[PDB]
C-alpha cells in the first residue's frame, strides 16, 4: 500500500510541476505579445500549450 501510494504521489507531483512550468512558460512567452498590436506569433507555442 505504501509503495503504490508513493508512486501515485510521485506521478501527481510530477504532473503538477509540469503544469506549473508550462503555464509560466505560456505567460512569459505570450504576455509581451498580448500588450502589443499585431501579434505575429509562431503558433507552435500556443498550439502546444493551449490544451
Amino acid at each position: 500500500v505504501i509503495v503504490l501510494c508513493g508512486v501515485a504521489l510521485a506521478i501527481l507531483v510530477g504532473t503538477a510541476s509540469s503544469a506549473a512550468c508550462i503555464a509560466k512558460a505560456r505567460r512569459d512567452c505570450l504576455t509581451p505579445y498580448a500588450l502589443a498590436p499585431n501579434a505575429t506569433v509562431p503558433t507552435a507555442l500556443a498550439v502546444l500549450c493551449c490544451i
Binding site: 505567460r27 512569459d28 504576455t31 509581451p32 505579445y33 498580448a34 500588450l35 502589443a36 498590436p37 499585431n38 501579434a39 505575429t40
Partner: protein, 153 residues
C-alpha cells in the same frame, strides 16, 4: 491626456494614472489603490509581473476611446503631461526634479497624440532624470526599458 487617463485613488490620494491603449487598460503592478471609474473597477487585471504591469480588456462602450500604440520613435522631444521629454541614445530623460511618486502610469505622448512609453519610475543621474519606462519595438514587442538606479514612483 485629461479625457482618457483615469487616476488610481487611495486614502484620498492619487497614486498613479492608468491608461487604456488599443482596447486594453494598463496599470503598474508596484502601485496600489482603486480606480475611480466603476467600469474599470470591474475589469479583471492579468498581471505581467516581469513587466511590472497588469492589463485587462476595456468594456464595449470605451473601446472607441483609447490612445494609440506606436512603434516609430525618432530621438528628440516628446510630449508629456508635465511638459517635454528628451529621447536620446535609446533612453528617455526629463529635467531633474520634475515628476515623482503618484505619477506612475503617465503616458509619454507623440506629436500626433500617440503613446510612446508609459512612465514607471525615474532615476536621478545628477544633471537630468532618466525615465524607467516600457517601450515598443519594431517587431511589436513591448520592451520595458529601465536605466540603472531607476526608482519606481
Amino acid at each position: 491626456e485629461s479625457d482618457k487617463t483615469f487616476p488610481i485613488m487611495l486614502n484620498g490620494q492619487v497614486n498613479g494614472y492608468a491608461c487604456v491603449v488599443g482596447g486594453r487598460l494598463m496599470k503598474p503592478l508596484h502601485v496600489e489603490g482603486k480606480i475611480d471609474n466603476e467600469q474599470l473597477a470591474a475589469v479583471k487585471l492579468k498581471k505581467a509581473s516581469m513587466y511590472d504591469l497588469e492589463y485587462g480588456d476595456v468594456p464595449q462602450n470605451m473601446k472607441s476611446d483609447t490612445l494609440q500604440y506606436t512603434s516609430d520613435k525618432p530621438p528628440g522631444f516628446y510630449n508629456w503631461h508635465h511638459g517635454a521629454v528628451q529621447y536620446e541614445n535609446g533612453r528617455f530623460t526629463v529635467p531633474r526634479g520634475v515628476g515623482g511618486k503618484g505619477d506612475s502610469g503617465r503616458p509619454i505622448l507623440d506629436n500626433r497624440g500617440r503613446v510612446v512609453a508609459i512612465v514607471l519610475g525615474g532615476a536621478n543621474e545628477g544633471t537630468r532624470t532618466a525615465l524607467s519606462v516600457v517601450t515598443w519595438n519594431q517587431k511589436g514587442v513591448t520592451i520595458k526599458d529601465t536605466p540603472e538606479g531607476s526608482e519606481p514612483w
